[model samples]
Target chain A: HKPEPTDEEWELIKTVTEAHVATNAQGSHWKQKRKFLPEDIGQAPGGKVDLEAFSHFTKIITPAITRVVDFAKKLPMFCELPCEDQIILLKGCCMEIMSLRAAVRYDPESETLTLNGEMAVTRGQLKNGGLGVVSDAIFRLGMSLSSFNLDDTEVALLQAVLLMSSDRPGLACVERIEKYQDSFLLAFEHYINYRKHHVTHFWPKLLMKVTDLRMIGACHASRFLHMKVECPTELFPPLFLEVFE
Target chain B: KPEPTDEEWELIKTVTEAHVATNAQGSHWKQKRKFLPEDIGQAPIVNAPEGGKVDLEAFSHFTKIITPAITRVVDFAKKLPMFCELPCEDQIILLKGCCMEIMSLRAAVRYDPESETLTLNGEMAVTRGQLKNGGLGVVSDAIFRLGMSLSSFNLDDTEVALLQAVLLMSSDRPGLACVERIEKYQDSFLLAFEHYINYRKHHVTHFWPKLLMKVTDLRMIGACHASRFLHMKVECPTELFPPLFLEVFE
Candidate 1:
C-alpha cells in the first residue's frame, strides 16, 4: 500500500506551495495600474496586428514568467536536474504554468480572467489583443478549473508536474526528468486525495487540466508566431523574445 | 554608545527621509483642517442602518485618505538597497505582504494620544467612536492600543522608518524563495536599529527590546485588520473595500 507523505515530504510540498503563492504578482499594486487587455485597441492599421496591445500584454506577463522561473528553482527536484535539461523543461513549460495560473485567477461570475492576479480582462478584450480563438479556449479552461476550487497546494504541485516534463524537445536526460515528474505527480496525487472531499476521480480531472494547459500553451505559441510576422521584433520585451522566439 | 558608520548613516538618512515624505504630519484632506484635538469629533461620520450595513460614506472617506499611502510605501520599499537586491519576484511578494502592516504601523505613528484619535497621512482625524461607527471597531481599537504602547518609545522618524524596513524584510513571510537572504537583510536592519537607538540615547540599553516588541504587536494587529476587513468585504460588495486595499490585503 502507498504510504502517507512523511514529514519531510510534507515540508517540500509546503515550500513549493509557499513559493507559488508568494511569487504570484496578481494582487500586487503594480497589477492594479494597467489593463492587460486594453478596452481601446481599435482595429489594426492596414489589417496589421495590434502591436501596442501585444506589447502591453507581454509587459505584464514577462514578470510572471520570471516569477515562474524563481518558483521552479525553489523545487529541489527541478533544481537537481541537469542544467541543459532544466533550460529545456523551463522553455517547454513556462507558458503552460502561466496558463494554469491564469486559469486559477479566472472569475466565472465576471466571465473574466484576472491577469497578473488583479487586472480583470474579458475574453473579448483578449481577442482585441490578437489572442483569437486561443483566448476563448483559455477562458473555457479557466472556467472549468475555477469550478474545482483547487487550493494552493494542489495548484503548486500541478505547476511542478507541468515543469518537469520529460518530453521537451531538447531534454537529453529524459529518464531523470521523468523521475522528477513522477515524484511531483505522486505528491500531487497523495496531497489532493489527502485534503479534498471532491469527486472520486478528482485527481484524473486535474490531470485533464494539465492536458488543457499543454494544448493552450501550444495554441498560444502558434498565435504568437503568426503575430511575429506583423509586429516589429524590437517592440517585444527581451525576456518575451527569449522565451517565445 | 557608538556612532553609525558612514555607510550605516546613509541607510539611516534614507529611512528618515522616506518615512517623513510618506507619513509626516503636515498635509491637508478637506481644506486643510488643523488636525487638532478640537477637530476630532468634527470630521465626517457615516450614519448607516442596522443588520450589517456599513457606513459607506465613512468607509469611502477613510479608504481614499489612506489609499495613497500604500503606493507611497511601495516606493519607499524600492528605495532600500537590500530590498532591491532580491529577486524581482521576492520584492513583489514582500511588498504585497507587508504593505498592509506598514500602513497600519504608520497609522499608529499618526495616532495622537491626547485626542485618542488617528490621523491619515496627517490629514483628517477620526475618533475611536467614529472608527466603531465606521465598522472598524475591533481592529481600530487594537491598533490604537498598540499605538499608545508604541508612543512610550518616543520613536523619531528614523526609528519608525527602520522599523518599517525590518517589518518588510520579514524572512518568515510565506512564499519567500530565499529565507537566508531575507534574514540577512532583516538582521542587518535590526543591528542598524539597535546601534542607532543606543547611540542617540546612550542612557538606555533596554529600549531596543522594548521597541522591538512592537513588531510582534503590529503582527497581531495586522492579522486582526486583515480578518476584520475580509469579513466585512464578504458581507458587502467589492466597492465597500478600496481597490488598493483589496489589492494589497485581500
Candidate 2:
C-alpha cells in the first residue's frame, strides 16, 4: 500500500533539488551531493535531498491515501450502475482516479526515469506499465485460468477492452456478464480460431454478438412483468462474467 | 349641402352601402346587382338584394355606430401622407369622390331591366340632384390623384436626373452638362453622341463611325465641363405638373 505525503512534509521535499545522473558504474544514481559543509536535513545550504523525510511523511498520511486508493479501485463498479445512480459515483470515481494517478506519478523513484514525473513518460510506456499491473493483479486475484501468460500486447488489449467497456454503454453491459464466466473458454476459442484460419478471427466479432444478445435481453427485461430480478439476471450476469473472465 | 329627400336619399344611401359591402357580395352577379336601387320622388325597390351584413354584424358589438367608418377611414389614411400633413381639404375631397362614385352607379342601375323606364329616370333625377347640391368632379379627381401619387414609385431615370439636377443647383455647382442633357431628352442627337462617348469610355463595342465621331467630339470638348445653364434647364417644372412633383422637390 502506498502512503500519502503531508503538506509540510511535501513542501520540505519540494525545497530540495534532487538530481538523477548517469554514471559509468551505475546506470543512474540518485544522490544528495553537498555544495556546502555542515549539512542540516532541514536548513542545509543547497538543501538536503532527504528520501527518509518524504517516506516518513507519506507514512503519516497513509490511512487517508489508502481510503482514496480503495475508492478509485471500486469506482468503475459504482459508475456501472444505472443513470439515476451515476452522477454521485462518477464524481467520486473521477476524484479518486485523479488523486491516485497524481500520487503514483509524483513518487520520487518513478521521477528518476524522466527526472520530471512518471506521467512524463510517453503514453506507450504508461500503457505498458498499466498492462503489467492489470495482468499481475488478475493473476493475484486468482482470475488467471491457465499457464498461458498474457503478453504485454494481450494485457494491453484487455486493459483497452476494459476501459472501452467502462466508457461505452453497450460494451460495459456485455462485458459485465462476460467477466464472471470462464473467460478462458471464450479467449481460447478466439486464439485457436485466429491461429487456424487467420481469416476467422472472432474476438471483437464475438464480443459484439454478445453485446447484441445482452441488449436484446435488456430490452426484454425492461418489458418483463417482474423486472427487478429479470433485469439483474439478464444485464448483470454477462457483465460479471466479462470482468472476472 | 341640404340632405336629399327620403326617396332621393335612398339611391345615394344604397350605393354607399354597396360600396362598403364590397367583400360581402357572394357572386359576381350578386355584386353587380348592388347598384340597382333607385331613389325617385317615391322610393322604388328593385330586384337587387342586400348583401351579407358582415361589417354591420361586427359593428353591433361596438358601443358606437360611427366607430367602423372612422376606423376604416383612419386605417386607410394611416398609409397616406395626407393625414400626416393634416390636409383636411384633401381628406374631404377624397370622401366626396368616394361617395359620389357610389351614388352615381346606384342611380344608373336603379331598377331591374324588366321595370318601367319611369323608375330609371326617377333614379337618374335623384342622382343628379345629389351631384348639383354639393358634389364636384374636381374634388374627386384631386383626391384620387393624391392617393395614387402618394403610392407611385419615384425611382425612374427622369426623376433621378431631376433629383440630381436639384442637388447640383442647391449646392451651387454644375452637374455634368452633357450627361444631364442626354438624361433629360434621351432621343436627341446630342444624346446619341453622349451614348457613343459613354460606350467608348466604358470600353464597350463601338462601330467605326460612332467611335470616330465620339473621339473627335471628346478632343474638342476635352473632359467637357458642366454649366449651371444645363442644371437650370433640367430642373423639374412645377406649375402645370402635379403637386406630387412639388412634394418630391420639397
Candidate 3:
C-alpha cells in the first residue's frame, strides 16, 4: 500500500529544501545559478584537443566542488551521518551531484551546456577540451530529463536522493544511509505525485534519470583519469583534483 | 507518465484487492503450494447426462465458475476513472468486448507451473484434459498455454492490475462513440506499464514489449472463444448458458 504523508509530515519534508535558501547566505547556489565559465567558450571553433581550454574547464568548475560540499552540508539528513560515513558519501557522490546540476543547464536544441547559468559551451568546445564523449552523454541525459520539466524542489530532492547511496564501495554504515534514503525517496515520491498526478510515469522516469546521472558520473571519472596522463601537472585545480581525481 | 497520486494509488489498490478478493489462493490461507496429484483433476467436470453429443453439464459448470469472476472483473472496471467516465452504453460495450480476455488473464494468476494446471477461484484445479472434457475443447490448450507463458514472467500484483486496466481500455472495440477518448486512456496505461516495467526490471531490456506481447495472445484467444461459444450455442439450442455469459459474450 502507498503511504500518505499528513500535513505535519509534509512540514518536515519542506524543511529539507527550505533550508537551502532559508540560511543567512545571500546566494544559495541550489536556489540561484552562478557563472563559472569563460564568456566565449561556445564561440571557439572545433579543433584537436586544446590543453588551455581543458585547464580552464578544470579551473572554473572548481568552485562547484566547494559548492557541492556546501549543498551536502545543508542537507539535515546528510549532516546526521557519522563523520566517516559522511565523507564516504560526499566523496563518492561529488561528481554525480555535479552531473545532475549541469544537466539542468543543458539546451538540447543547440547541443550545448550553459555552465552555471551563463557562458554556454558547445559540444565541440567540450570535445576540443577532451570531454566530448562525456559531454554528449550528459546532453542526452539532460534532454530526456528536461522533457519532464522538473521544478527546483524536485531537482533539490532528487540531488539529495542521489547523494545518499548505501552501495558506495566503502561505507561504515550502509543500513543508516539506506534509512535516510528511504525517507527522502518517499518524500520525493509524495511531492512528485502531488504536483503531477496526471502524468503516471513521471516518478519512475525521474528515478531512471538518477541512473543516467550515475552513468555520466562514471564516464566522467574514467575520462578524468585518462586526461591526467597527458595534462600538465599545474593544470588541474587543487579542489578539482581532490574531488574528482 | 507520472506515478499514481496518493488518492489514485489508493484506488488502484482497492481495485486490485477486489479483483483478487475471492481468488482460489485466498481460500486456503497459510497452506504450502506443494502440488499433490489430486490437484490435477480437482475441478468440476460435467458430462452429458443423456444421449446428447455436446457436454452440456460441463459447459454449465464452466459458466458457474466464470460468473463470479466476471462479476469481479466488472467491479474492477467500474473503479477506473476513465472507464467510469464513459457513457453507460459504451461502458457495457467495453465490458462485453473485453471480459473474456480479462477473465483468462486473471485465471493465469493462479497457474501452478509444477502441476501444469490452473486453479480456478483458488478452488478448482483444472488440468488440460479436464478443461477439454468440460467442453472448452481446443480453447482449453490455448488458455492453458496463455497461463503457462504468463507464469514464467512472475508479474507482481500491481503489474497485473495495470495490465488488466490496459486491456480494458481498448480503443479498437467496435461500436464505440469515443474511440479517441478511449485511446487516450489506453495510451496513458501503456505509458504507465512501460515505465513501471523499466523500474521493476531495469536490467532486463525489452521487457515491456515482451509483456505486451501477451495482449496479442489474449486477442487471439478471445477470437477463438467467441467462435466456440457461437458454435456451441448453435449446436445445443435448447441448453441454457449462463445469462451473464450470454449478455457479455454471445
TM-scores of chain B, in order = 0.85, 0.19, 0.81
**Residue runs of model 3 more than 4 Å from their true location after superposition:** A1-4, A19-48, A108-110, A197-200, B1-250
- Which prediction has more favorable TM-score, 1 or 3? 1
Compute DockQ for each candidate against the true complex: 0.01, 0.00, 0.01
Score residue B50 of candidate 3 by CA lDDT: 40
The CAPRI category of model 1 is: incorrect
Model 1 residue runs over 4 Å out of place are A1-4, A26-38, A42-48, B1-250
lDDT of 2 by residue, B1-250 (tens): 1223454333323323333343112233322332222331222234126421112221122112222333333333333222234334443433322222222222222222122111111221122222211122122222222222111121212222221112111111123323443233323323333332333232123333433342233222211111211222244232323332122212
A116-194, model 2: which lDDT tens digit per residue? 1111222223213222222122222111111122222222223222222333333334455345222323343444333
Rank the candidate models, highest TM-score first.
Answer: 1, 3, 2
Model 2 ranges off by over 4 Å: A1-153, A160-245, B1-250
Tens-digit lDDT track for model 1 on A183-242?
Answer: 777777677656643333667777987998899889878888877887787777788878
Pick the winner on DockQ between candidates 2 and 3.
3
Candidate 1: pairs in clash: A26-A116, A26-A117
lDDT of 3 by residue, B96-171 (tens): 8788887778776566633557676556666776666565667778887667555335566677787788888887
DockQ of 2: 0.00
Docking class of 2: incorrect
The i-RMS of every model, in angstroms, reads 24.5, 47.6, 17.5
